[model samples]
Target: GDAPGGAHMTAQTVTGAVAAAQLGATLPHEHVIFGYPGYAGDVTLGPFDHAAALASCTETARALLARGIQTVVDATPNGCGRNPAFLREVSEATGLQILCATGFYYEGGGATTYFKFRASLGDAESEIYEMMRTEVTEGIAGTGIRAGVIKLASSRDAITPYEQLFFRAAARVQRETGVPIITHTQEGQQGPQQAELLTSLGADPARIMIGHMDGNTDPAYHRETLRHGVSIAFDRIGLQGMLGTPTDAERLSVLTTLLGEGYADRLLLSHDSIWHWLGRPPAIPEAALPAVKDWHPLHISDDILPDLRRRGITEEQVGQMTVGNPARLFG
Candidate 1:
């Protein structure tokens, strides 16, 4: 028998519903397009160029399609530029399945102001639940493009009261709709707490993916997070040393060790590469750009897998991370 709540799942892509089995070699977490809040207000960045941004993102999507990646879960949440209409355009242009998210990010409550202000009118939790459910069922922003997964996040070591409200709302949505939850753990530190909070609020641990596990170098941290029975994403594959993140070599060392310890079924792989930033490009030192240049959706295929093979990681284990595990979570 399959694991609990693992059967009959269908991942709602930007284009339409696809059986989880059809999500071949999925990039479980990535951003096709992202714009940080206050990008428009930032004078140095100036205005967003939508046409140019779309062109860049479509080119990136085409590159991924060429590499046999059938699906990409866009982790950009509401108020952080979750543009499903643009995602649909990219999907149409590239012939790749794309899953977008609906929920708030962790910083100052992305889109939380709307929910928070409604407290006097009704229960904030119920209001959030309704909005998330509406996006999943009806569509996002009246664009008729539905979200596939609920994206949530936590900062540092704590889930703030405001953030916890979003988590509770996400938990309610997951309970009612059976959609999976993916989370952001800053510096790879909050995975265990996130898992505990969500599962305690009636979410199925099997349906959650604790992201950014690659940001940390501690094997003990990784093991503790996985012990909660949720999947852990070594999602930031090629990003190293920018903002004090772990090196890819360090991430792979932890991943190979975890695989050897029989945790492959609960593992996911991604680059978390922001293929196109919507506003002005943040000031990245020229020296740092090359370090993250190969951090595209194809990095795992072009670089990481061969290295994994050299390390005696089997083809089946790779298949589990790229194929089997994704199907289990999104299907």
Candidate 2:
């Protein structure tokens, strides 16, 4: 089934077309380069050191490739430092298949911003659908680099009206293009809300990934989301002690429990690690830094897999989460 174009379909990479089976040892959610413009303060700020950021990201990609990761999904959304050219260059340098996203982030609050104004338009859903369609079919910002996935996000415990519009638009685009949809769930509270909305809008539940389920420790929450027949991303694997999240040990316990419950085929894994984030200081805050100090694309391979095996997770289950599941999403 790992054969190209067999059980799984094909996927788009930075360079060109790739069979989904070639997305070997994928990290389904990771950021190559990201920035939170207007985050925590003013909108007007320096662009950060692009040269340095690119260098750092390339280095990180090389390290990840050396560790056997062959594909990475750069889940950064539009207006949030999603650069296709930068990702292309990194892929060229590291020989890793990279995929970028097309959509708006959940945090669209600002003075006359893109996400706010666009969603406020009269034909908001159609407008958003067209934008995403162009990005997936044509290229991002005239860069000739097509997006491989659709990204959507929601507020904590609720899908705000505007967020709902985004979900609808994303679902429309996915239905039209058959590209997989990935989403952000604030504090792991909105997975079922997102699953319900997307599937209700005729988006394939199997093609949707409800991210950040690790933010919650409840197996019931995971079960409810899985009941929709969608994949769940425990993407924030190494993040802890910040935002009152559970420890890695706690996350491992939850993961093994889900696997024991026979949900391995519906699970996706990642560090959700942002390697280079453009900011005022070019680094995350002191408190946030410690939480992600060990978080990288390789953490799953170097650390979590061993832990999973120690907890009695089989190699086939690990392969399902790490490899087969992602391929199926792209397929």
Candidate 3:
């Protein structure tokens, strides 16, 4: 849910499918408002037409309120693409208690080039600690919008040297901050590898989330990760094409199956619907097939939720993803 495409969000987009699409009453991962990836590069981002943005975010919040969504965890990191001042504005406008995130997850030649100077300064660990300490203690440099958790993302497996380096930095940050770590994992054994690395670095396993885990077909792999006391984040359940799951029904089946196996506590759900509202040009490979197919319901809707209901997931399970579990992680 990046910035709405045209001024404000439609009531239909907010209530019916959007709320119902979550399948359960709760949604652990969602953004009331977001911006384009490079939107933060604007030096004037803080002062950038926030009046309009707040107006738009409020419309979306009304929908969540009608649907009884208790909270929203904003994942805008410090430098990636966030405006804390604007976040405060949106919260005030909407009366929504939003939990924000703080950390370093991006790497390589993309978005993370600024960290190159810090990497040259030393191993990435020192810089990571400073960012974590600042956000957790001073509220992302005094914007009044404090982050509730730390966000981390990984590409490929733990075997890669670069991935290992990122993991080490994340471990160090988690140790210093004591904030929970929610990770973005690519398709591979990266999730398990992250738990191992974090635990070895003295991080509490319950605080670790191997996000984007629905990409893997094998539920046993996720169950194994949960066995270590780590949570398995089904972050992209709604964005099937982007994650290679192919259909909404396919992904919903996985969620229902896993919940039935007595692993519902380890489950977390989200659409990762960042591009849906952004007036960004055409779709990328990373975009979900719903954008490509035109008939698919990418976020949540009658198609996704009914299937979960048919599979018999309880309302309490829904609350676990949307309300209870996230409250534990952030509060």
- Per-residue accuracy of model 3 over 1-331 as CA lDDT, tens digit each: 1111111111111111122233224444555445444654543524345456567676666565565664555665555455556556655666554556776544531366666665777776566766665665566666544565677766664434444555666566556555667777766457777787777877767667778777776777777777767777776655545435445565566777788887766777766543223223234564444534523113443345545666687767766665556544443
**Candidates' TM-scores?**
0.93, 0.92, 0.77
Candidate 3 residues lying further than 4 Å off, grouped into runs, are: 1-26, 32-49, 108-110, 159-166, 169-173, 243-246, 275-289, 292-306
lDDT string for model 2 (166-210, tens) is: 788887777777888998888768888889989899888878899
Which order, best to worst by lDDT? Answer: 1, 2, 3
Q: Residue by residue across 1-331, what tens digits does model 1's lDDT show?
A: 1354623336799998998778889998999877777654664656667788778888888888888888999999787777898899889988889999988888553546666677656787777788888988778888888889999888886887767877998888888788889988887788889998998998888899999989888899999988889999999899888778878889988999999999989999999889787677767789898667767778898999999989999999999999999988887
Task: Provide the lDDT at 12 for model 2.
Answer: 77
- Model with the higher TM-score, candidate 1 or 2: 1
lDDT of each: 0.84, 0.82, 0.57
RMSD of 2: 3.1
The lowest-lDDT stretch of 10 consecutive residues in candidate 3 is 8-17
How many residue pairs clash in all the candidates, one count each?
Answer: 1, 0, 2
Regarding lDDT, does 2 or 3 come out ahead? 2
Q: How close is candidate 1 to the true structure, as a TM-score?
A: 0.93
Candidate 2 runs further than 4 Å off: 1-9, 39-45, 107-113, 119-121, 282-289
